[PDB]
Amino acid sequence: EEERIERWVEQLREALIGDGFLLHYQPVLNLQGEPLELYQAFLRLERNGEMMSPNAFMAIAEEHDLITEIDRWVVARAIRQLGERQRAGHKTHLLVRIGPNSFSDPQMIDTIREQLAVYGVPGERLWLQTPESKVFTHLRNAQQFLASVSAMGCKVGLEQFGSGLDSFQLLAHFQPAFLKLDRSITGDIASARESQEKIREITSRAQPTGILTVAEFVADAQSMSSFFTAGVDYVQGDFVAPTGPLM
Ligand SMILES: Nc1nc2c(ncn2[C@@H]2O[C@@H]3COP(=O)(O)O[C@H]4[C@@H](O)[C@H](n5cnc6c(=O)[nH]c(N)nc65)O[C@@H]4COP(=O)(O)O[C@H]3[C@H]2O)c(=O)[nH]1
Secondary structure (H helix, E strand, O other), X not given: OOOHHHHHHHHXXXXXXXXXXXXXXXXXXXXXXXXXXXXXXXXXXXEOOEEEOOOOOHHHHHHOOOHHHHHHHHHHHHHHHHHHHHHOOOOOEEEEEOOHHHOOOHHHHHHHHHHHHHOOOOHHHEEEEEEHHHHHHOHHHHHHHHHHHHOOOOEEEEEEEOOOOHHHHHHOOOOOOEEEXXXXXXXXXXXXXXXXXXXXHOHHHHHHHOOEXXXXXXXXHHHHHHHHHHOOOEEOOOOOOOOEOOO
C-alpha cells in the first residue's frame, strides 16, 4: 500500500508537465436556456496504455496537494480548446470544475486572465462550478475569487445546490451566475412530490436575479419533461448526451 500510491503520485506530477491528461466533454442542452453551445469538462488520464478516470487517483492528488496544480491544468486546458473551437468560429461555452483551494490560488486567477486573453476568448464563455458545501466553508476566499474572475466576464456557479437549509442562505452572501441543482432533489421529480415543488422554489427564484439553473444527471425522458415545466435553464445527464472526447 505504502507503494502503489508512490507510482501514482509520480505519474501525475508528470502529466502536469508534458501531460498525459486530456479532456472529455458533455453536452449541456437547454430548454429555458435558448440556446447556446455548452459542454461540461471532465478530466481523463493516460496511465499506461489506457485512460484513467479521476476515481482512480483524485484521492491521491488530495493527500499530496496536487489538486490546485491539476485544476489549474484543467482550466488552462479548457481555455485552450476554447481558443481552438473559437478560431474555428464556434463560440463554445465550457463548464469547468474548480476545487476549494483555488479560490485563494492567484496562479489560477492569473492562468485564467492570461490564457483567456491570449486566445481571444471572452471570459463569458468560461463557466466555473464548485459545490455549495465547499463554498459555505472556504467562503471569504470563494467570495473575492468570484469578484476576481467575475470581473473578466467569467461565470461562476454552484454545484449540488439545494441540499441543506443554508443552501438558500449562502445566496444572500455569495451570488452565483448559475446553480447546478443537487441530485438529491433532481433525480426523482417524476414521482417525488416535495421535489416537484422544490425545483420551483428554486427555479422561480433564479428568474429574478437571472441566476441560470442546471439540473444534471437526467436519465429518462419522463424526468426530461418535468424539468421543462419547472423552468430549469439547462439539462445534463447520460439521457441527453453522454460524455465524450469529441466535440
Ligand atoms: N457531474 C455529472 N456527471 C455525470 C453526468 N452524467 C454522467 N456523469 C458521469 O458520472 C461521473 C461522476 O461525476 P462527478 O460526480 O462530478 O465526480 C467526478 C469528479 O469528482 C472527478 N472529476 C472528473 N473530472 C474532473 C475535472 O475535470 N475536474 C475536477 N475537479 N474533478 C473531476 O471524478 C469524478 C468522476 O468523474 P468521471 O470519471 O468523469 O465520471 C463522471 C461523469 O462522466 C452529469 O449530468 N453530471
